[PDB]
Design a protein around this ligand. Structure first.
Ligand SMILES: Cc1ccc(CC(=O)N2CC[C@H](NC(=O)CCn3c(=O)[nH]c4ccccc43)[C@H](C(=O)N[C@H](CC3CCCCC3)C(=O)N(C)C)C2)c(F)c1
Ligand SMILES: [Zn+2]
Length: 416
């Protein structure tokens, strides 16, 4: 599935380059997001990959595709040497530039015969003029900064050699920087953005299996209150709850039905003003309202229940929307209530799209969402297979296959 579930769609030359130089058949969603932002928007990136794997493609692919140069700053010397070896095994010219390197290799770099150049932060801070000449003559596709959290003095593994990296954006303001890390700390990420002088960067955070989230899919009965009664205990939810609806009309229907039971809840849609949405968010965090019925950023630490009333839009929005739950690490649940006649499964609503690539993309996303909803397989396995590479999937242990994972694992443990 090279360009199946990705928008903008990777063109056929890009898929060819991927298959031929990296041996992969498709881009993972976050990989394509980073690569496309770098290639088309020249935009800085802060990329958190929780498990640590799956970040090599993000900074190796763009300079190979465009045929220019890519700089990789890292302190992990043995890893950089192994990656140089692996790249040269794939007919990708790459080298680990340092102080003890021949001027033959240096002029080869200046002539643009190396696709990827690995350097230490010390050497990088010691030779900014070389980097500027490389940008002027060849053109630097991106500058990757691995272990970027080391630039934060507030973190555990601060390295002084990262400090001077603050000058990069000063000397090459048009060259995008891709700062990669494995920590999800918001303050660490703010420090990375600040010290690297990044300009409105795209921030991605992926690589989780979220063991504290239980997944389940149920069919609608047609009656809103009958559908939502199992989530209630005068009447109230078991905890702070978000209900995602596909439209504002269904949002209002659900809100009125819940308020028939004197439930403390509030609506959250784009048709309201900024102040009203901020007030609803503040009252949700303060627990004055127990439930938010929304059509989509709701940031709250102790969300115990997410309910999609209706089939979600696609796997990406569903991913982002159930990710809001259980941020405190405590047990939470994510239920989808769906029916084949739901709006987000209506292909007739796509017949008017003019861009044929976009029409195919919408059809593919709709079909994949329906196949997830109808599947008897492990929901978490489906999500991780769609979003993460195999190495990230295998790093997940302790949740998949247990009765706290999803409804299908639970049914396969119970009598069949
Ligand atoms: C089994 C399973 C179920 C669900 C998920 C998804 C998931 O757990 N998250 C939680 C972590 C992260 N969200 C956030 O950073 C927002 C804030 N935030 C939150 O709401 N909870 C958080 C917890 C920790 C840190 C920040 C949090 C995930 C997410 O959408 N990233 C996207 C990247 C993008 C998503 C589409 C495909 C391409 C790439 C992102 O970075 N954007 C800026 C959009 C979703 C999963 F990973 C595994
Ligand atoms: Zn499962």
């Amino acid at each position: 599935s090279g360009s199946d579930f990705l928008w903008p769609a990777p063109n056929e030359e890009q898929v060819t380059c991927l298959k031929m130089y990296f041996g992969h058949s498709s881009f993972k969603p976050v990989q394509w997001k980073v690569i496309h932002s770098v290639l088309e928007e020249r935009r800085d990136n802060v990329a958190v990959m929780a498990t640590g794997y799956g970040k090599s493609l993000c900074f190796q692919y763009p300079p190979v595709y465009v045929g220019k140069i890519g700089l990789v700053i890292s302190p992990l010397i043995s890893l950089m040497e192994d990656q140089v070896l692996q790249l040269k095994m794939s007919n990708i010219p790459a080298c680990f530039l340092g102080s003890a390197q021949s001027e033959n290799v240096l002029t080869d770099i200046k002539l643009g015969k190396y696709r990827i150049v690995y350097v230490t932060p010390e050497y990088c801070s010691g030779n900014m003029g070389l980097l500027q000449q490389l940008e002027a003559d060849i053109g630097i596709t991106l500058i990757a900064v691995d272990e970027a959290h080391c630039i934060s003095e507030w973190g555990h593994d601060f390295r002084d050699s990262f400090r001077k990296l603050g000058s990069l954006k000063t000397a090459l303001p048009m060259v995008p920087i891709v700062a990669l890390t494995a920590t999800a700390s918001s303050s660490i990420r703010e420090d990375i953005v600040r010290c690297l002088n990044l300009r409105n960067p795209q921030i991605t955070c992926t690589g989780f299996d979220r063991p504290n989230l239980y997944l389940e899919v149920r069919r609608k009965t047609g009656n809103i209150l009958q559908d939502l009664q199992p989530f209630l205990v005068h009447w109230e939810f078991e905890g702070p709850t978000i209900i995602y609806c596909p439209s504002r009309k269904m949002t209002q229907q659900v809100t009125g039905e819940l308020r028939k039971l004197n439930l403390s809840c509030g609506t959250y849609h784009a048709g309201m003003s900024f102040s009203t949405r901020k007030d609803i968010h503040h009252r949700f965090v303060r627990d004055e309202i127990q439930c938010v019925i929304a059509t989509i950023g709701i940031n709250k630490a102790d969300i115990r229940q997410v309910i999609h009333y209706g089939a979600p839009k696609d796997m990406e929005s569903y991913y982002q929307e159930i990710g809001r739950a259980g941020r405190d690490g405590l047990q939470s649940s994510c239920h989808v209530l769906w029916a084949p006649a739901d709006i987000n499964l209506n292909r007739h609503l796509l017949t008017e799209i003019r861009n044929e690539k976009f029409r195919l993309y919408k059809l593919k996303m709709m079909a994949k969402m329906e196949k997830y909803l109808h599947s008897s397989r492990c929901r978490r396995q489906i999500i991780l297979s769609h979003f993460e590479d195999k190495q990230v999937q295998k790093a997940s242990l302790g949740i998949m296959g247990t009765e706290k994972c999803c409804d299908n694992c639970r049914s396969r443990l119970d009598h069949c």
